Write a protein that binds this DNA or RNA. Structure first.
Ligand SMILES: [Mg+2]
Lengths: 165, 165, 368, 346, 249, 63
DNA sequence: AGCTGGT
DNA sequence: ACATGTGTGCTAAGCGCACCTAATTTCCTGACGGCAATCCTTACCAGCT
């Protein structure tokens, strides 16, 4: 629940446990797939949720599923970008973190369709981010100037970049 | 509109002495000189009894003063954020482009009466770049409704559109 | 009991405060751009003012060991001091530490030099730091202290470092639309050359505005953190009144010597403070008659009227003051004849407010 | 005969909780749950606590229903820091809440008109401080809107209600998702293999014990049964003021009253009068009372137009009676006398 | 019978509600991002201080209040700050502090309250006229002390300007007045434009009780007509308190 | 001891300081437009004056 | 003799 | 914000301008400072109630 220097609160993390189950045990297979995540730090129970994800077994891409195996790093790196500057532990844009959960809920309803990589990919999943980002940029730069429109447009181009770990 | 066109056409009919006394009244309200008020009344009264829509009085006075000072010609499709921006592409992006760009954005956060001097410097650099045409009707009906943010954002996005092309 | 001090200051073209990029500070108050002066800059300039020197007794330093080493002619204690500080809780030369100056100087010198220990030496140094509350600038601005929990010892503790600020300086909001102005300067190369050009073509931004400045004293807090005495409290209140009416933020004053003085003081005694920011939610647009100062005072007096009748507090009336020098700028030009004690001086209003504080005088208190 | 009331759920914020909330992450669902409108129902009757478990939840638990999405609101998260033993020790407890923002809904409640008739006089007048399922989430629209009627099928009732519009140039969802319960068309029917299970069915209330239910997705495009509604109601103020009235019928007759009330004379610089000036522009005048006008000669009315046309136009006027606007009027009249060109008109 | 304290409240530039990362909190309404203070924050600010305590049956039978999130009448405008804590002891270089960044927002808010008939009578405490006394305290105690926040560095305690109190029993927030965020036109104030929007919404909905209206020295009228949309264009401190007192009993 | 000098000077039609585009330096003092001469101009005119030769001795140079 | 704030 | 207060009695028509014109070089800053905590335990143990 804390957005620390290295984490940004997004949603249920169905994305994380895909490397060790689509490469080691069971792998690609037909049947409806179910995911359970019970996060816990030391001795504190913090949440519980579920996810019925779609899976038929149409092979796998190692690298793309490796990027999908941790989107939390990409989301935190997108959140930590400030409006202007280069300081490393500035909080960045805190209203980006307030639109990440709805965007995650909009992306994740066809989470297995995104998983199997048929027509859903990383490069077209962030297209839904644009609307909330336009209205957040309307809040952020409340000037009718050429410059403010330019910063709004540069704010729009923000999207989570994949990481190879 | 079918009311502002007659006002601009009547302004183009004005002879040298009338716009000379309009030139002498820069930054001065239409009260401290009798001939200036008489000229404004002659220009401004008879267009309300022939067409139901007329510009605002302050917009008409400011536009008459600026027209006398600069003396452009009326041509459709030559609004301020097109010629502006077209001249911004003829610039070095390092130093001079932010200078002229800030000079343009100063207009977007000002009320009608105080824009005489920023519009003066904008039209001064327009005159330096040898610009003959200016859509006085288009400028007038985007200025009479300058207090609503949709037309300001449309004007700014017109500057963006002319800059990217 | 708490004291409100309001000013309306018009300033010459100046840059008293800038952000990282160098622009004067701006805030979106009432849907329009208003020029802003940061509260911390005003607090610092009033701290460093030329009349607070009898009361300037707080130091905000990370070079505590340097302060110890300065007052030691031949006894070099700067590595031992550094390791004592490093296990005090600060971890490095340290973070910023607030304390009284002379107290830490002499008695940290006597408690550091003795070769009696290294762990309890750090513990007693930390206790000396934490007990350093005998300073009214700390009492006004406020101070907490948070040492690390990693680079420390398990046998070193910290007492409660709770000090509340007895002053709420507001940011100086402009009374109109901010017109940020761009200054273009060059730097002349003194020796000549082929190019005949500037050494450095640079960017500076300045703003001329009539700032609504607003401070507030929590006198009850000012004495609940300055122990049982009231003499030092009255001296600090008078010192702040003199400093705020007399000093200016030390921004680019060498390039913009805007040392203009507050054209308005409004001191009102009550238990529910008010800023007259809503007096200028409507931007002040000047007319041909009068000036920006008078129109701003007129809107302020209109607001004082409908918050002295519409929001009337006749259980605790206003003791609303002025600094109208020989009545140059009256407040009630049309109806607001509620200025009970309109004067034209500064020491008189200082003495008056310490008189409603209690049985004090201006000259007798000015010795603590 | 009216078997259905269309509940109108609309506010700045709202939330009907989902099942995945036991710890500090408290979440919602993208539909008003059955016990997210039945709680509103129980509050609307004015009771609560353990009374709803008997004869109030089973009194309608045999009754199917359907919900409609006018606009899908986005999910918002609010920071919430419970102070625990602070206004135990000062250990501040932590949490995060899920809020559905700017979402309008329409629930159906079908089967019989006696309970709907009892329920129609329960939404507006009887209250126990009803809200949108969250205690701090106000209903921004009259919940008693969309009056009841007979529409036999679930889709006919859910699509036979007009759809609102806030401003004129507003995007409108062309597909309206429908959340419907399970209809056992014959005994022994098995659910289709797309119906997700929702756990919104209470059998007790405090503490919450629950039953699950089957939910069938359904669709609705606009046009065939549902349609946009009249909007009107201008949300643009821009303070009103009339202008430019020469004569309708009541300026000819009203000019003379102060002309000869003041004996055919001026008022400031007394002389034979021609026209009438207007003070106190509360209304510019289609109907003018005879104690606001000012019959006044040509030159000083020209000076009045001097002073008014210069500087602010506003609604405050000159009123040449209180002697503060005197020197300017006389000076403007002096330059009128010195500089007027009658051959150049006016 | 139900009490709806529809309240406007402008704010001088200062941050009041802070999220994890320190920003002013935000809400989504009308297809735009607007500034927000949490209902818990303002509700605790109504408690925890003795000026209002001059009430434990009302914020605890549970409690008796519906406090809404402060929806801005316009779009959110979050700004950012830049502070430098000086060294004040001369070192080899200058500047020492955290050199961090703060952030703030100035907004004009709206909220809605709800106190029902039995929700105030069964509140009781010990009297039956307490069901009028506590409410009479509330109608201007809700506009008594702005919460808290970074007031020692951002001093903002701007009192509200326009206050509604309605006795309509059907609980409806007037937030649909602010479906379109309030723009600014030069001849009217932002608070005046917001109050005109509230008035324009007031003239609606009655087509398909009274309007008890507060304007201090009636600078803000609910409609620029003789056909006043509240018909009670008055108000002075506890005059409204006593008028609600003998409206209830 | 702080010596201050306040000078009221009437100047003929002139352009004694200008920005990049050639307009004289203007400021908005009191809400109205006033012409302005920068303090660096008077500072360097004091420095490069016809009585400060005996008091020179600085070079803020790059060569 | 147990209890509670600290390790 | 022309009309309307005529009061012996207040005209009026023809006429209103074209063209050459707007330049550049270069000059643009380095460094120092960037917060700590606290929001579930290797849990029993001894200061003392
Ligand atoms: Mg006259």
């Amino acid at each position: 629940l804390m957005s620390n220097d290295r984490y940004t609160f997004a949603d249920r993390d169905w994305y994380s446990p895909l490397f060790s189950y689509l490469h080691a045990e069971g792998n690609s297979r037909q049947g409806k797939l179910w995911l359970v995540g019970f996060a816990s730090d030391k001795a504190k129970s913090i949440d519980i949720w579920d996810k019925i994800i779609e899976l038929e077994g149409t092979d796998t891409n190692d690298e793309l599923l490796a990027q999908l195996a941790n989107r939390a790093t990409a989301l935190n790196a997108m959140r930590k970008k400030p409006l202007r500057g280069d300081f490393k532990k500035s909080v960045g844009t805190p209203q980006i973190a307030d639109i990440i959960p709805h965007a995650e809920n909009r992306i994740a309803i066809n989470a297995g369709k995104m998983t199997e990589n048929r027509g859903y990919s990383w490069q077209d999943a962030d297209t839904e981010y644009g609307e909330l980002l336009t209205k957040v940029a309307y809040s952020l730069e409340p000037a009718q100037t050429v410059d403010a429109r330019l910063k709004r447009g540069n704010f729009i181009s923000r999207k989570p970049w994949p990481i190879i770990p | 509109n079918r009311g502002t066109v007659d006002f601009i056409a009547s302004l183009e009919n004005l002879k040298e002495g009338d716009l000379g006394i309009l030139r002498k009244l820069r930054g001065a309200r239409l009260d401290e000189k009798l001939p200036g008020f008489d000229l404004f009344s002659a220009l401004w009264w008879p267009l309300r009894q022939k067409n139901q829509r007329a510009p605002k009085r302050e917009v008409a006075w400011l536009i008459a003063k600026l027209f006398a000072e600069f003396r452009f010609e009326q041509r459709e499709g030559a609004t301020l954020p097109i010629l502006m921006g077209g001249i911004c592409r003829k610039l070095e992006p390092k130093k001079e482009l932010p200078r002229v760009l800030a000079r343009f954005d100063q207009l977007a956060s000002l009320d009608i009466m105080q824009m005489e001097e920023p519009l003066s410097v904008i039209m001064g650099i327009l005159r330096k770049h040898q610009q003959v045409c200016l859509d006085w009707v288009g400028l007038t009906d985007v200025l009479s409704f300058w207090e609503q943010e949709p037309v300001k954002r449309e004007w700014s996005d017109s500057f963006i559109k002319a800059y990217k092309i | 009991m708490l004291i409100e001090i309001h000013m309306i200051q018009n300033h010459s073209p100046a840059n008293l405060n800038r952000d990282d990029l160098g622009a004067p500070k701006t805030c979106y108050f009432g849907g329009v751009l208003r020029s802003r002066i940061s509260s911390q800059c005003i607090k610092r300039s009033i701290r460093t003012s030329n009349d607070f020197k009898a009361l300037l007794g707080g130091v905000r330093t990370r070079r505590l060991a340097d302060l110890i080493q300065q007052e030691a002619g031949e006894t070099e204690c700067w590595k031992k001091a550094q390791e004592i500080l490093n296990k005090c809780g600060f971890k490095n030369t340290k973070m910023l530490v607030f304390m009284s100056k002379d107290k830490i100087k002499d008695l940290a010198r006597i408690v550091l030099d003795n070769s009696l220990g290294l762990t309890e030496a750090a513990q007693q140094v930390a206790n000396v730091i934490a007990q350093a509350t005998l300073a009214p600038d700390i009492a006004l601005c406020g101070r907490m202290l948070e040492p690390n929990d990693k680079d420390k010892d398990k046998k070193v503790k910290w007492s409660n470092t709770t000090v509340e600020a007895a002053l709420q300086v507001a940011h100086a909001i402009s009374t109109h639309i901010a017109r940020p102005e761009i200054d273009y300067f060059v730097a002349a190369d003194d020796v000549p050359g082929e190019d005949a050009g500037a050494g450095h073509i640079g960017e500076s931004m300045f703003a001329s505005a009539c700032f609504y400045k607003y401070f507030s004293i929590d006198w009850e807090q000012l004495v609940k953190n300055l122990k049982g005495d009231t003499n030092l409290a009255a001296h600090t209140v008078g010192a702040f009144l003199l400093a705020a009416a007399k000093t200016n933020p030390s921004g680019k004053q060498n390039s913009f010597a805007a040392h203009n003085y507050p054209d308005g003081i409004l001191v009102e005694f009550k238990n529910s403070p008010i800023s007259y920011a809503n007096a200028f939610v409507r931007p002040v647009s000047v007319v041909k008659e009068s000036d920006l100062v008078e129109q701003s005072i007129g809107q302020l007096s209109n607001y004082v009227n409908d918050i002295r009748l519409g929001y009337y507090d006749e259980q605790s009336p206003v003791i609303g003051f002025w600094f109208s020098p020989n009545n140059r700028y009256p407040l009630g030009y049309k109806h607001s004849k509620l200025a009970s004690r309109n004067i034209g001086n500064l020491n008189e209003l200082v003495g008056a407010v310490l008189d409603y504080i209690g049985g004090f005088k201006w000259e007798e208190v000015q010795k603590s | 005969p009216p078997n259905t009331l269309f509940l109108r759920l609309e506010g700045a914020l709202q939330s009907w909780g989902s099942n995945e909330a036991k710890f500090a992450l408290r979440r919602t669902a993208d539909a008003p749950t059955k016990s997210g409108v039945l709680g509103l129902l129980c509050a609307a009757m004015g009771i609560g606590r353990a009374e709803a478990a008997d004869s109030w939840l089973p009194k309608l638990a045999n009754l199917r229903m359907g919900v409609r999405i006018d606009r899908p609101g986005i999910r918002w998260w609010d920071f919430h820091t419970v102070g625990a033993g602070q206004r135990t020790r000062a250990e501040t407890l932590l949490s995060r809440r899920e809020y559905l923002a700017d979402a309008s809904f329409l629930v159906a409640l079908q089967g019989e008109p006696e309970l709907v008739a009892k329920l129609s006089a329960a939404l507006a007048k009887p209250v126990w401080a009803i809200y949108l399922g969250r205690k701090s989430c106000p209903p921004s629209r009259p919940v008693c809107e969309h009056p009841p009627g007979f529409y036999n099928t679930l889709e006919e009732a859910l699509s036979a209600v007009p759809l609102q519009k806030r401003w004129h140039n507003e995007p409108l969802p062309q597909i309206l998702p429908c959340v419907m319960d399970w209809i056992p068309g014959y005994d022994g029917e098995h659910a289709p293999d797309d119906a997700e299970i929702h756990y919104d069915l209470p059998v007790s209330f405090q503490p919450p014990r629950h039953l699950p239910r089957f939910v069938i997705r359904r669709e609705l495009v606009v046009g065939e049964d549902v349609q946009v509604s009249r909007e009107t109601g201008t949300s643009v103020w821009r303070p009103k003021g009339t202008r430019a009235d020469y004569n309708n019928s009541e300026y000819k007759k009203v000019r003379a009253e102060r002309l000869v009330m003041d004996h055919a004379a001026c008022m400031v610089c007394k002389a034979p009068a021609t026209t009438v000036q207007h003070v106190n522009y509360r209304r510019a005048g289609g109907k003018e009372i005879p104690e606001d006008l000012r019959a006044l000669c040509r030159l000083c009315a020209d000076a009045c137009t001097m002073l008014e046309y210069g500087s602010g136009m506003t609604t405050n006027r000159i009123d040449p009676c209180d002697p503060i606007w005197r020197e300017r009027i006389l000076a403007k009249r002096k330059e009128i006398v010195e500089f007027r060109s009658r051959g150049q008109r006016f």
